Design a protein around this ligand. Structure first.
Ligand SMILES: Cc1ncc(COP(=O)(O)O)c(CN)c1O
Ligand SMILES: Cc1ncc(COP(=O)(O)O)c(CN)c1O
Lengths: 396, 396
């Protein structure tokens, strides 16, 4: 068996890594990373997390299994971050949360739940989107279709082309929205647009699936769910997949959740059971450590105070780099307007460079970036900003 | 969309615990648990585990992602544990290990790998088996078929019906073997019987899949891998799904591995990349905490020393409760020979009790058992042994 299995193709983001740690020549800049890096270039453990991990060390008495849905307090804190402090969704008891292995595991259990219990046969994702959205939905047996999103010329949300591509989508199709900090584009709808899409979605019959992986990195924790909260205001049913990988620095402990809301509680209880059946045939029940660290910090006023300040300085660093990048491009002599970098959100933006420009940048040296011209702004430091900008100007 | 989604039935194992908690009776006994419980009735955190968690607390500088296959020495260590330190499979670089969320996770990853890359279509599981076996394989789109195993009349392995049901069972069918401590019977093949099944497995063309959830709980760490090792001597190809939930008491940190062995190095690397492609569309990369704890313990000779003793104490406690159960039973008047209980391994046995006697023990007494009559011997203490045997003697 296996004698003739063909290799899997190299995961585009994930293959640049080894080319980088193989280059080993001097002042290399890797901007194809998917994680936050500080001014040192390190991805530290938040000290709010180090303080909650020692409370757990000293307080845990069992590593017995968690329920299929995970830790209760985890679920409740997630519903308050997503829908806000006193919403009807929470008080009417219309939402159920299964703690999950990361934002990806959330996507995948929604997908198995949806493939196995509904008539959904499609999901519309944006062009472009995180590459792995096509593969997780596809591995569940769903067809993924692409709506338009980006304007390659003006560097914006081509709203008129997104509405228009979306008009081909039928009722009972799921449409996938990135809740804030769009990967790879960083371009996000205004509240006025989110409300347009909300209303259009009610009347055309889409099921909304929000993927909320960077809450806190564009504007702020609540501001960032303004979009999800306008859909939630008017939808009877919707699904939200989130991740605490980026805002808690908890990448490898696999921390995310998958929230179901339905019209009332007895329906969402009946549907969450089939969601829970999906989890049990997948990994049985979730990793406790990282979700325990998330629920400890969010449950306690002192730790949550320190965490919000750690999320704030990460947000503010990215914002300082976006600004310091288009100013250094200006004074080192760039002949294109990069102002648009300042209008986009979170760690990613398309620099607007050609495939052959990113290949020459890497080979004629030093700057590594995703072949799409995607650049992670958190890989820039005041120290490497001038050699990086040096090289981008030298290839324009 | 979720309006007419139907409930999903009570999980056989899971749903009993509620019934118990919620019964609020006096001296009640729960033998429907699936975790080790000590003499006092609790599932503690191993001392060696708590020492590696302080080591990690003090030493981790980042929670940046793990590769798709997780921690390398985690993988090296489980290959030596499974196949012994000088195995040709290791020296010839014929096996690849991916770290997964638990043994359930390992089994869903093998299933998605087989279902979407291979031609498998069928996997044969013993009758009876752990009930969630059928659900992980069915969720990936594979038929599960049953082979006979257990003789109710003599309480043994009737090898003749097992060998006879694995006939025909087409070349290229998957056959799942519990490596040691068969759940639910505790009935295991002898080394002559493992060697016969190995020989008949290469004659016939089957793909063996070992579920290895309890290594160390029958007669030893190494004694318990003789079966697998007897197949691994003769096969070109083999999959192993192991869990570190029980022998390390790390139930909820989801620690398990999925090992692929193919006939040589180049084939396992081409087949393992499609395995990684299956992982990446599921949860993307594995929970780091529980597996970091298993690699710190197994790679530090001091800690490994304390752990093997902790593991040994748990094996011996279960061996004592098995003797103490048939003894107390013979003294309280027990009408039937229960000596077979001592012949079986690990934490489970079928008590040989009727669905109606199992409800008699719950409704009239405090004894909770799964309706198959499966009891977990680790839920017995020197203390409750005699109220428990008085109740089953009353229903015989
Ligand atoms: C848009 C998006 N969705 C999901 C994920 C996956 O999140 P996680 O790392 O929590 O699995 C990411 C992160 N790579 C993402 O950017
Ligand atoms: C035979 C068998 N296989 C796999 C598993 C799953 O182990 P885990 O809880 O680590 O996923 C168990 C335990 N429930 C088991 O008994």
């Amino acid at each position: 068996m296996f004698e003739n299995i063909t290799a899997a193709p190299a995961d585009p983001i994930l293959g640049l890594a080894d080319l980088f740690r193989a280059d080993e020549r001097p002042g290399k800049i890797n901007l194809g990373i998917g994680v936050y890096k500080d001014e040192t270039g390190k991805t530290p453990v938040l000290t709010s997390v180090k303080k909650a991990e020692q409370y757990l060390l000293e307080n845990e008495t069992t590593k017995n299994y968690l329920g299929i849905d995970g830790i209760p307090e985890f679920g409740r804190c997630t519903q308050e971050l997503l829908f806000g402090k006193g919403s009807a969704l929470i008080n009417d008891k219309r939402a159920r949360t299964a703690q999950t292995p990361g934002g990806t595991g959330a996507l995948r259990v929604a997908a198995d739940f949806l493939a196995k219990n509904t008539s959904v046969k499609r999901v519309w994702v944006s062009n472009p989107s995180w590459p792995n959205h096509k593969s997780v939905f596809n591995s569940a047996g769903l067809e993924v279709r692409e709506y338009a999103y980006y304007d390659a010329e003006n560097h914006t949300l081509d709203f008129d082309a997104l509405i228009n591509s979306l008009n081909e989508a039928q009722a009972g199709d799921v449409v996938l929205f990135h809740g804030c900090c769009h990967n790879p584009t960083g371009i996000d709808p205004t509240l006025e647009q989110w409300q347009t899409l909300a209303q259009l979605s009610v009347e055309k019959g889409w099921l909304p699936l929000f993927d909320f992986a960077y809450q806190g990195f564009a504007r702020g924790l609540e501001e960032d769910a303004e979009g999800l909260r306008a859909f939630a205001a008017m939808h009877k049913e919707l699904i939200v997949a989130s991740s605490y990988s980026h805002n808690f620095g908890l990448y490898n402990e696999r921390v995310g959740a998958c929230t179901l809301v339905a019209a009332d509680s007895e329906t969402v209880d009946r549907a969450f059971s089939q969601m829970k059946a999906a989890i049990r045939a997948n990994y049985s029940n979730p990793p406790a450590h990282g979700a325990s660290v998330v629920a400890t910090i969010l449950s306690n006023d002192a730790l949550r105070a320190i965490w919000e300040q750690e999320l704030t300085d990460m947000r503010q660093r990215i914002q300082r780099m976006r600004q310091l990048f288009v100013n250094t491009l200006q004074e080192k002599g760039a002949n294109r307007d990069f102002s648009f970098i300042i209008k986009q959100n979170g760690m990613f933006s398309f620099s607007g460079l050609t495939k052959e420009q990113v290949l020459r940048l890497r080979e004629e040296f030093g700057v590594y970036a995703v072949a799409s011209g995607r650049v992670n702004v958190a890989g820039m430091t005041p120290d490497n900003m001038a050699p990086l900008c040096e090289a981008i100007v030298a290839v324009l």
